[PDB]
Amino acid sequence: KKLNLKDKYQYLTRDMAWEPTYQDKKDIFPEEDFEGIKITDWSQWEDPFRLTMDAYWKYQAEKEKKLYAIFDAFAQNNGHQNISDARYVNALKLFISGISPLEHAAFQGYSKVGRQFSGAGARVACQMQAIDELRHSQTQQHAMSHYNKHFNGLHDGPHMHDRVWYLSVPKSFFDDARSAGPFEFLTAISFSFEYVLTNLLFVPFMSGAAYNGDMATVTFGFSAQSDEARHMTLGLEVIKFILEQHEDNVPIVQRWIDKWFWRGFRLLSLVSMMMDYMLPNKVMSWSEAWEVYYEQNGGALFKDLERYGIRPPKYQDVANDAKHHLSHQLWTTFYQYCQATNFHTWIPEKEEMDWMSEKYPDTFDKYYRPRYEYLAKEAAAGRRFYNNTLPQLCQVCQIPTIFTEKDAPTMLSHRQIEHEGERYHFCSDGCCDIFKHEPEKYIQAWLPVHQIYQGNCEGGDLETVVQKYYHINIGEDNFDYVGSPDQKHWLSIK
Amino acid sequence: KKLNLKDKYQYLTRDMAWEPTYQDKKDIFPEEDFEGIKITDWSQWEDPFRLTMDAYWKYQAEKEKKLYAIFDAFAQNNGHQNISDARYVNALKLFISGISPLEHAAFQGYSKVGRQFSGAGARVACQMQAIDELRHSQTQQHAMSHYNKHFNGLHDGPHMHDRVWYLSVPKSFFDDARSAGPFEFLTAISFSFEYVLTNLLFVPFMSGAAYNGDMATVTFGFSAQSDEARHMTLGLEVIKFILEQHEDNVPIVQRWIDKWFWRGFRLLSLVSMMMDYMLPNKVMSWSEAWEVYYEQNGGALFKDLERYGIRPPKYQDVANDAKHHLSHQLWTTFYQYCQATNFHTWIPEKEEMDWMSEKYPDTFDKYYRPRYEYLAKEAAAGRRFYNNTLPQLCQVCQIPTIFTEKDAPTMLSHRQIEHEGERYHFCSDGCCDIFKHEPEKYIQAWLPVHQIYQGNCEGGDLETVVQKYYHINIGEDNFDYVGSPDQKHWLSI
Amino acid sequence: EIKTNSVEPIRHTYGHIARRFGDKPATRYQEASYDIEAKTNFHYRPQWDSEHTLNDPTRTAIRMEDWCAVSDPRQFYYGAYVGNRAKMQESAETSFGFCEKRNLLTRLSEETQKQLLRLLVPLRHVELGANMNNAKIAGDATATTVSQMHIYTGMDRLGIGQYLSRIALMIDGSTGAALDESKAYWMDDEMWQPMRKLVEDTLVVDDWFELTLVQNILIDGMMYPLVYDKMDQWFESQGAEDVSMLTEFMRDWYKESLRWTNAMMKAVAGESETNRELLQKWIDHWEPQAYEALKPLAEASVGIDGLNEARAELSARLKKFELQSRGV
Amino acid sequence: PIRHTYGHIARRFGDKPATRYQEASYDIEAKTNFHYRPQWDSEHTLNDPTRTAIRMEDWCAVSDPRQFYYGAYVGNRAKMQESAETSFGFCEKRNLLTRLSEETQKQLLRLLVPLRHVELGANMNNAKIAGDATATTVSQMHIYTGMDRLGIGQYLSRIALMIDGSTGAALDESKAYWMDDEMWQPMRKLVEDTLVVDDWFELTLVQNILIDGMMYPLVYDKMDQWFESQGAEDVSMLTEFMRDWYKESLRWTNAMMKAVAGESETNRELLQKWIDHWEPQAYEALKPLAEASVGIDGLNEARAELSARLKKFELQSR
Amino acid sequence: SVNALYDYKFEPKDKVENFHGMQLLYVYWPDHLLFCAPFALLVQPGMTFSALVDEILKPATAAHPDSAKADFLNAEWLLNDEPFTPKADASLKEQGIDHKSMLTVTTPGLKGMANAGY
Amino acid sequence: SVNALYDYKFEPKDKVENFHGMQLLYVYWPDHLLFCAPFALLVQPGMTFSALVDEILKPATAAHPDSAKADFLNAEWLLNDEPFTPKADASLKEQGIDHKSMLTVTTPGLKGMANAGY
């Protein structure tokens, strides 16, 4: 009988594979046993999307031709002049140096994993994801290109991503996933990042663009929607497939959910700060985004996973509670250390602060407003605060240890341990537990503060590290927004 | 023996035509003799471009994809909020009601003329131009669509074109060309309009857009550039062909050059006012535009043509002189009659007036600046000037007779004649001369002031004419910019 | 899941659009195609016509309360038209390159090549006639919906004539010699004379609707099936099967053209018994001339039964409009 | 503007406006300071140039003459698939495959369609290379070629689905030839052997130059001519995509080989050692296919064409 | 003269018969460019020259500062470019002011503002 | 423990040997969140506790209003979370302040600004 669409698509993908006779299957696919995951039957893989190559090329070429027409029009018409305020471009300096390089890392990681799985069906989904991430990487370089001509801090993204202190947060997140085996890579990136936490990254950046006049970024976001629909479906297929294949997979997957929930939460702390502080026109608060995208949507997903014996991630309560504090703790960290970053910070306008009091009724006026009162009096007196002493970094997530106890918002949630005669420090219980399960991995970390003190950052004094190692142009890319070349150029554009 | 590119293209166009046997050529092609133009050999036609249909479709589809992606992005991103000032949109009100409808008339005119010529080479070139003109007409409807949603005056362009007084200026220009025979049609539109006078329309609108943050118009402009290269080349081939075909064509063509130079010039007076006064950020003065695109570029063209016995157009001296006056004369005309227009007028800012002093060093402070000083005081006193008496219109170009004598800027260049018992009035010698050669044509003109007085504009009180006949919403489309719904909506953005 | 801050528009579309379809957002086709042309207050009578004004609906004897009743099912405004054609020409250009690179036409015997030059290639002259007739209609029809469908189709006819030309150029190796030969058949072979006379007769028709009917329904509606369906099958028996890939453009074009030509006939015939009376008179005069012009071609190739079936197919089609023709 | 391009592009090309390809393709990857060693490799770091024994001072010396960044790739492919899709519809609607004789149909299932398995092997090998090469200029050419192999595999599969009226029975019949017919076993063994190669440049050499460099000419040129003598000329319109793809693939694969071989004598000596081991195996894999169809002469012609190509790199084969 | 395919002769659109017993009259007042063009008026041919001045011309020219001072009846007149002496109490028709005539009135000593004839 | 295809055992990147004779020391001053995180210092294991305070800790904290009022030293100290009593004139190393220790120093009466521990 005539094939239905699902059996037809299988004949055009998985049927091209065969059982080897001349080489051992374990030599052709050597990476899929060492994690403990047991696969019972690859044929139970359900294709998360059914796109043959002809249809992929046709549809993506249509989106691309439209995207590039818009990008050229943006540039030809000096569309950077129509953003809300030059402060907004700081969100893009963060994006190009901390998020774009991840797109490119995902391209390589998915390419490799689209070779490792013995299931032909899983390999094709992974490979289509790989070439989409390549697209995301390159179209972002093209999107930001025109901003790089007119604003500072966008000029050496990949160079800074490997070196700069705060960019070790996204870098080590993705190094952790790509050093892991293939099932953990998929659980980390496809399920945790691309399915569970995706909206917390995507919605703030892309709707921030829409509210702040950035036609290039919003066009890139519209263009990436159909791609992310496939990526979310792969993430959902991945956890269900793995959980159903063998009861022994369930506790392994549980531990990965706990680890990558917690690493993903620490990585997203950078976005909380962006959306609450770096956007002149606000979309929603971090607290509202967390509540909708994780507490509501994620709660329903984790209720779904209960049928497999899965519970919600460990410490998700700590993360739900931190939503009232996160963006304010981080902005204040970046403010005092922006002599050593490739973006500017500033004190929020009085109107932004009243918006903060409303979005954060239980915390902002008590804990955060007085900080800005003090820092502004200091700045007004010609004593704009910069902190010239290096901070303690977490051994796992590598963020400075700036976070506070759930029960006590004024007390740092520092933890420390002894492991084989050496001392290690963490920002929280969540990072402590990750280290304790895999110490051999985390003791390898390239912690930027420690590396500066070892003399591995081509400089002992911090001016030389910032200018010569980081390629941050002192007086141009760093320091307060007020009085910066970006502010002067904006005021003259205007 | 392989065909070269020229000869191959000819095999793919003109070789498909044949000498008829069963019907006489003159019944198939009945319009080619009456104008007195003589064609000696159509094989002498040199294809102005060599584009087979596969290539035309391919290349135009790529331009259209990109254009529509930008239009969509402009609208999704509320791009109208990024223009220099809402006063700018008045330039588009004049465009959608005055010029877009000429694109559509050209589509019709070129379709007809792409049937009428007996040389298949000329027929294909005109047909490709007809479909290009349909493209301009439709994409302009789509370009202006977003502005129509946010600003007034753009909602009934075609309706107003047929009726509104000042729009009879472009309507009559194109009805004159379309009612003429096929050779005059091409001489008028392909040579005079699309080649000689083309940058005086295209540049001010498209540059003005660029300088004023109008991405949709700018993008249409960039898109139309390759179409215009063809249309210009058709214009050039047309006059060279017709001039070379017989020496008896040279006097006929010279009279068409004189007529169409003058009619084109009068039409362009609307553009002078748009670029000097309606663009918040200025590109160049009408004075400068005319110097470069006509006096320089046109000057060089007519030296080419001297080889054929053609001299530069009659009255060109008067037009060169009038460049010091034109935009100011028109702005003050529109200012006083903008109760009866689908767009606003205003007094220019002191900074714009200073610019005008610099660009019109011999005329502006003497004749025009003092007008704005007077009108501004009156406006300030609650007495904003509106002229409630209708004007005399020129029998040919249909503009009110507002223009002045060369070297006497305070005296109107009014002319009048008597023809078969009737009196007729003109703005100039240029228009008087066109009338005297073809009176049987111009005596038929639908002159909006006369038709209002005959009771043919469905109203006798002018409030009724403007609202019910013209579909201009009184209080929204018309009157001064200051106080207008457009201003208040702009401030509110 | 991108959030957006969109505005409150003052109105949704143009007044002329809102009058016709309601004050609500309009399609690209609607804004491009309805009430955009000049309709009244023309300033001067044409020097080239004693009887009608510029833009005069009386250039045809057919009468319609509203010529915008005739609308395009394909919704082609300019950009949709060229976008669709660009896609089509992509496949046609690649098929031409393939036949040219592989010598699919030049490897045929000289006798098979002459059959193409004699039976197929002179149809470019018919295409030329149809280009000219549709340029005439596009210039005479008053409604934008009607005139745009005619300029698009006239430009397609020129494109089709160019493809047929290139087949000959393929056969002569880009020299033009095969085009000379084929033109000599059109001009002097008795087989082509009824067609050539009929095409020349159409070029003198005044009434534009009479013209669209004869050209776009009666001639095309018998010719295209006879040639690109029935003759196309028969080419296989002659060893010329490979020309099928060169004429696929024409089969796809034809199938699409039935959409708008049937919608236009339905609206004009359904308007009034008078329109229908008039249409029947024109079919009675012209349909048998179309058949008689195709007869020597059918006889020289696929046989008269191929033509009789095409006539029957046109007849069945005309019955949908409450109109008659004398095939099955 | 304060600057014309990104710092990393300006270092290579000058502070002047750069091309879309340049901005998409150079120095975008992570290069150093990796936080953790791979759990799946004891010898190499993440992004480690030493995954190959080939040595280059700058892997960005390998640039794509087609200038394919993502947008240009899919743009080019979308154009090519428009024509392929139309040829598939034309053949299917006119019954051009189902009207062929049963022996002709069996020749297509036995000699042509099992190449979809070879394409799968090439897809997997190129995915490996994309995950292993460091330079973005090199890695993206390998993912594009990988996805192309999948697409070519899918067009081959559809030829069989057209023969069987979209039931899958022909693909079953054709897989049994791949698995059990003696004529396919040398090729199956070779493809499985490539899947176990560690050095990514060895793999790119073997797959993208030696196997494809003989196989594509043999099949889509020489056997293509032969199929016309067998009554299957109409299949040529379905395999035109493969001929156009392969002509295009020569541009980047020859550019890559010139840059690597021209770098050093030590690189050339490595490449030659690999040619000497693998080139004879590619020839032996194809021999049973050639002798079942066009004849061994067609294979010797393809082997000599590859030999002449390898002289462009100052390398040689038999 | 017009070339055409036929005998190209038409009635003027603006013949007097088309104005319902009324007539068109144009009036130009030199050096008062405040009004951009000569006025186009629709008048009863029987009306007296005096009433043209008091009931039409006076209120039409009201916006101009010079208006209140102008003695139009006693100013310098042209009719169709020819020296003209109005008769106040005679009708327009009976003194030769026919359809589409233009009158030019020059008021010496009142030549507009700013030495700009405005 | 880490799953790997090999024995996944490496030396820690931040062992004391990598610090050219020095050692890392972290200092936490609770209720002074003006400094967002504990300080990470590079220190000579031979320097005295009183030199650490006067040469390093006092300069590091100078930006806070409480700094000038603080007697660190006679404040309350923890070392690796255990109660600790510093010896002013004794080296860091002889009192057990080893590589990557954290000292916590609480200064009674100086609790930061604004009831917010800032």
Ligand SMILES: [Cu+2]
């Ligand atoms: Cu700039």
Ligand SMILES: [Cu+2]
């Ligand atoms: Cu609005």
Ligand SMILES: [Fe+3]
């Ligand atoms: Fe992505």
Ligand SMILES: [Fe+3]
């Ligand atoms: Fe994604």
Ligand SMILES: [Fe+3]
């Ligand atoms: Fe145009």
Ligand SMILES: [Fe+3]
């Ligand atoms: Fe044009």
Ligand SMILES: [Xe]
């Ligand atoms: Xe495989």
Ligand SMILES: [Xe]
């Ligand atoms: Xe951070």
Ligand SMILES: [Xe]
């Ligand atoms: Xe993103």
Ligand SMILES: [Xe]
């Ligand atoms: Xe972006």
Ligand SMILES: [Xe]
């Ligand atoms: Xe998986």
Ligand SMILES: [Xe]
């Ligand atoms: Xe998660």
Ligand SMILES: [Xe]
């Ligand atoms: Xe994340």
Ligand SMILES: [Xe]
């Ligand atoms: Xe730093």
Ligand SMILES: [Xe]
């Ligand atoms: Xe620092």
Ligand SMILES: [Xe]
């Ligand atoms: Xe820092």
